A paper describes a structure:
To investigate if these differences were a result of targocil-II binding or the choice of ATP analogue, we determined structures of [name] produced in L. lactis in complex with ATPγS alone and with targocil-II. In the presence of ATPγS and targocil-II, which is bound near identically to the AMP-PNP structure as above, we observe two approximately equally populated states of D-loopON (3.0 Å resolution) and D-loopOFF (2.7 Å resolution). However, the mixed population also suggests that D-loopON is less energetically favourable in the presence of ATPγS compared to AMP-PNP, where we only observe D-loopON, possibly due to steric or charge differences of the thiophosphate that could repel the approach of Val173. This hypothesis is also supported by the observed weaker binding of targocil-II in the presence of ATPγS.
Numbering used by the authors:
A (entry chain A), B (entry chain C): 1 to 270
C (entry chain B), D (entry chain D): 1 to 264
Amino acid sequence: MSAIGTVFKEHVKNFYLIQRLAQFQVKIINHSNYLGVAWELINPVMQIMVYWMVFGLGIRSNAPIHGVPFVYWLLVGISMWFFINQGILEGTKAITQKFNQVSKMNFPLSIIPTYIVTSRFYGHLGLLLLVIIACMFTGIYPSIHIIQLLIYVPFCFFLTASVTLLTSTLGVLVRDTQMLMQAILRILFYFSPILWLPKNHGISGLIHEMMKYNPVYFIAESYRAAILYHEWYFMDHWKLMLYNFGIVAIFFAIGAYLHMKYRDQFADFL
Amino acid sequence: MSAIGTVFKEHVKNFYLIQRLAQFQVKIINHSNYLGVAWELINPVMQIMVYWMVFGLGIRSNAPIHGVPFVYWLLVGISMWFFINQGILEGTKAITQKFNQVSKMNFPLSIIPTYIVTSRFYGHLGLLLLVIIACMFTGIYPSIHIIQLLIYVPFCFFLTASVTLLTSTLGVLVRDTQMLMQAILRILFYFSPILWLPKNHGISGLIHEMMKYNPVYFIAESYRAAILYHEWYFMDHWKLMLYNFGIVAIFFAIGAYLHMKYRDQFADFL
Amino acid sequence: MNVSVNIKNVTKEYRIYRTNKERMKDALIPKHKNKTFFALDDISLKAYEGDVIGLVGINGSGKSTLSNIIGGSLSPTVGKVDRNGEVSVIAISAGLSGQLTGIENIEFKMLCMGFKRKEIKAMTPKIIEFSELGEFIYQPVKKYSSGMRAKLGFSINITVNPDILVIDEALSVGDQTFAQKCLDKIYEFKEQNKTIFFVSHNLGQVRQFCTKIAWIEGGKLKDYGELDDVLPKYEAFLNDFKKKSKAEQKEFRNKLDESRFVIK
Amino acid sequence: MNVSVNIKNVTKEYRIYRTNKERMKDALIPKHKNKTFFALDDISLKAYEGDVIGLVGINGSGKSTLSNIIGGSLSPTVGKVDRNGEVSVIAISAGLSGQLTGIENIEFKMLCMGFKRKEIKAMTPKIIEFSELGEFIYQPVKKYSSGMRAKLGFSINITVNPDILVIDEALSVGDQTFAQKCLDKIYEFKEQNKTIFFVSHNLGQVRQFCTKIAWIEGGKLKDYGELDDVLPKYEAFLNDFKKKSKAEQKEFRNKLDESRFVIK
Ligand SMILES: CCCCCCCCCCC(CCCCCCCCCC)(CO[C@@H]1O[C@H](CO)[C@@H](O[C@H]2O[C@H](CO)[C@@H](O)[C@H](O)[C@H]2O)[C@H](O)[C@H]1O)CO[C@@H]1O[C@H](CO)[C@@H](O[C@H]2O[C@H](CO)[C@@H](O)[C@H](O)[C@H]2O)[C@H](O)[C@H]1O
Ligand SMILES: CCCCCCCCCCC(CCCCCCCCCC)(CO[C@@H]1O[C@H](CO)[C@@H](O[C@H]2O[C@H](CO)[C@@H](O)[C@H](O)[C@H]2O)[C@H](O)[C@H]1O)CO[C@@H]1O[C@H](CO)[C@@H](O[C@H]2O[C@H](CO)[C@@H](O)[C@H](O)[C@H]2O)[C@H](O)[C@H]1O
Ligand SMILES: Cc1c(CC(=O)N2CCC[C@@H]2C(=O)O)c(=O)oc2c(C)c3occ(-c4ccc(Cl)cc4)c3cc12
Ligand SMILES: Cc1c(CC(=O)N2CCC[C@@H]2C(=O)O)c(=O)oc2c(C)c3occ(-c4ccc(Cl)cc4)c3cc12
Ligand SMILES: Nc1ncnc2c1ncn2[C@@H]1O[C@H](COP(=O)(O)OP(=O)(O)OP(O)(O)=S)[C@@H](O)[C@H]1O
Ligand SMILES: Nc1ncnc2c1ncn2[C@@H]1O[C@H](COP(=O)(O)OP(=O)(O)OP(O)(O)=S)[C@@H](O)[C@H]1O
Ligand SMILES: [Mg+2]
Ligand SMILES: [Mg+2]
């Protein structure tokens, strides 16, 4: 109860500092490139292209899903994945990499993974705007339902942030954690509706039911409902919403407790 | 002609130094892990597992290829890919990362990417021995044809090394190179016989003919011929052998020329 | 007067390992005993407002550990430290990034130190004037020389106004002209009746700056008191040590390191 | 006697950029002109065997650039350097890894310096004896203190036997007992009639060690000659500089930096 309050207060009091440090990190990462920050959009785009040639052209022989061309289905479904992947992979390393620069200073230590996540949220927002603009050429124009994004884009961010708040502490105590996530994230990519849709009513039915326990399922399906299908997603799937809210709350609580329990001895493990 | 001679002499005179520095690098990379160097085998194994559940169980419904179970086909075909991927991805960064430590000393600079490649060749050799042992449980025992590996395991190494000798120089002059390879290597993974076999005689026939211009095609097919099919591979495909030898020679020549042209001004670009 | 810093029974221990099997066995088994190294051992001293205290001792004595424990960046294994007031540390190179320019580095480091946006905006021009870089304030710090990096770090760092200050082996930086500026700033800092902890090997600087001496030997507090009663004793010990043979010095160091290691 | 180092018309230039568009336009267009900064400008001096030469000047003068160009780690834009003999540089912290132990670091650094395996095996025990670490030779260097890291680096590095030696602002390290050892080693190095280049701000050390003085001002060679004819002149200039006002010093520095920048 005190750990949650401390972490919440530290994050609420330092909004401007989080944004500024995220911007400085984006500047530092792309310093020597000739193109600069443009790579923050170029790298995610190329990866989508390959994924269209393998799973759309090769497999599926370019077959539409649910009355929509496969290219736009995949485009709307995959826009948030690079943010999640990179945000978790670097938020797990954040404290180990950045503790010594601020240790002598009096600094709110719980905001270190959060600004590392924000530096990737910027590129996610740019890509999502590009995707919405690109969807207008086929004839899919924004509707009233697009307002749902005001709940769905924030939630995604929160989810990622909560995970890092745990995996930053675990990564200081035990370094092997950094090697485990690489294997876990891959499982979360292929067992999700980003590239394919399970058949249901069969041996694929159990796989579908298990897939519904992945939060990426809810994220991709809600984005598609807001942008492509013109539907109010929560009018049929509020139980998944409650399940995912519970997941985020559990991750945040455990991460806050562990972080406030071990933060004073971080110099021992580093 | 002088650049080739200089690079060749520098590599030939320093075999022991290359091996020692590769071992020190392997020690440095895994320092804080509880398991230690065991991860050098654990990480490649897990990635194979996922690739078996997605492409073997999901797609293909577990269908054999060429009279062999799919699991062993994939296992023999994928054993060298992690070495190639990691070796190129870190050999591109080697000089940028390690120039300043040896610049004041009189050091053979052309061997910096090579020992970074050797540090990954160690784990490749361990995984290949494990794969050969695992193939004995089904009833596939070593034959005389296994001696072909004495030509095929070295060639793979040479190929990787040659590429880095170019991409280490290009990565110092232009940093954006480091972002391009990530996208190129992915194309080289899916357009290869590691996971699938093209149909031929059709629209897939042109894809097969283009795929034969990938060196990974020759590497995987030669490994499988030596270990699985009990065949002398060069008795039907010596033209592919000559093509790949020419490729390696071209890469080595261009890399040596550029490296000896720019090495004296590496401090400007760094 | 009033106690500003109060240190009571501060102890710092470390665990020494040879192979990964030892480390794992200690991590798992609760009873497993191993070698333990005492970096500090039962340090107690009371500091008052306006006291300048200089830390003296040979290599490996434990003065950086004590100044980190006072600074708040490190925690005792046993005992406790009570601070009355805000604490700051002079670490000039900490927040500098070679990718950023000098102007950007000023804001980055001032943000990491805890300043607010309005203060950063107000005090940037004075820092730029002090550092005396000129045009190179508009260039990445990786294009600087060593003296210019030190000058920028010092100029950013000297803008704090704490109640307790900790300095670790850097009183002045740069060429002969910058050193006088740095010394004048430090003397002004002393004038305002602030508590200062100072770690150095320059005994002339210690004689002209500090007022108390803390002698650290083998992780222990050998002596503590006024400068003119304690510094001559350390100097006499130092002059006696140079007059021994090599075997005597090796024996002294081995005897010192014997008491610091214990199996438990 | 015999010329050992011969420097002829050495010039070093750098290109100054403000935005990425400028950098790209310069990279593409062959005629594009930009600002250019002259770090060095037409340096010529002849060194003889047995000469100890001390480099003096204010911050940003260009002595590290000259010692890197002599050392071989940097290349001139114009001119040439002729060396007669093998060249070594004292850079103690270069090859040390915090992940490795001390014993491993000895071999790693000696390999990077160019030694053969048999020599490394033969000279490891003497280095271990010199560094005086004791048991901590079996521990990772990241568990050391600063003095012990410096002592290990110096002990590894002092084992070279070159014809030309370059030292950049480190004559002795450690506490009061180690400094005498380091100074004795450096004096032995001078005794063997070896050419030494030395960069420092300590003018007493320069007076007691060097025999020639090279004065660097604004990237140029102000003067060069015997110690007793040149060092008093630099000291007189230095004492005159402290007696100007702040505006006069700013004007002097601005005038100096004016001549170093040129559009071309
Ligand atoms: C592939 C897998 C391989 C194996 C995986 C690793 C096996 C476990 C390794 C144990 C480990 C990882 C964290 C484990 C739990 C984290 C997950 C939690 C759940 C996640 C969902 C910490 O383990 C924790 O150590 C804490 C010590 O702070 C201790 O805290 C509290 O305990 C009580 C209440 O628990 C409470 O009364 C007590 O007051 C607390 O201290 C915890 O109880 C204990 O669990 C790391 O090992 C640690 O290494 C440290 C030196 O770096 C070392 O500290 C130092 O202490 C002295 C001060 O200088 C000095 O002697 C040394 O410097 C060193 O000795 C720790 O002693 C050692 O333990
Ligand atoms: C996403 C893409 C974005 C755009 C991509 C980049 C566009 C090109 C950028 C050009 C670039 C990349 C290499 C390009 C070719 C490499 C691939 C080859 C083929 C691969 C299959 C080098 O370009 C090369 O520069 C060489 C300079 O050494 C020059 O060498 C030879 O030229 C003649 C014979 O060519 C020969 O007579 C001549 O003697 C050689 O000097 C080459 O001709 C020239 O091509 C990098 O830019 C460089 O930046 C350097 C400062 O870091 C800068 O050097 C410094 O020089 C002064 C000394 O201090 C000083 O003033 C400054 O310190 C600085 O100015 C270079 O001047 C500048 O050029
Ligand atoms: C088609 C395909 C199967 C299916 C396959 O091969 N299977 C599984 C059981 C039935 C069928 C067979 O028996 O052949 C696969 O698994 O991976 C692939 C990868 C990894 C692929 O990367 C690239 C392509 C591709 C891209 C463009 C174009 Cl124009 C054409 C191709 C591509 C196709 C497949
Ligand atoms: C089957 C499958 C298609 C094929 C598919 O969906 N297609 C393409 C055209 C025809 C058919 C369809 O119309 O449904 C695909 O593309 O990706 C997949 C990914 C990315 C997958 O990751 C994991 C599985 C999986 C693993 C185990 C088990 Cl036991 C079951 C599953 C998996 C299957 C597919
Ligand atoms: N993580 C660590 N594990 C074990 N021992 C350590 C660790 N950090 C420091 N020590 C030891 O603790 C002792 C005190 O070190 P310090 O306090 O850093 O040195 P110091 O007294 O300041 O002397 P200097 O800086 O070399 S002049 C030394 O024996 C160090 O080797
Ligand atoms: N990469 C670079 N690009 C542009 N200017 C540079 C670069 N490296 C160094 N300089 C400048 O070159 C000049 C000479 O620098 P140095 O020779 O390193 O300094 P110094 O003369 O040794 O004086 P110190 O070390 O600060 S006492 C300075 O004005 C530097 O800012
Ligand atoms: Mg210290
Ligand atoms: Mg310098």
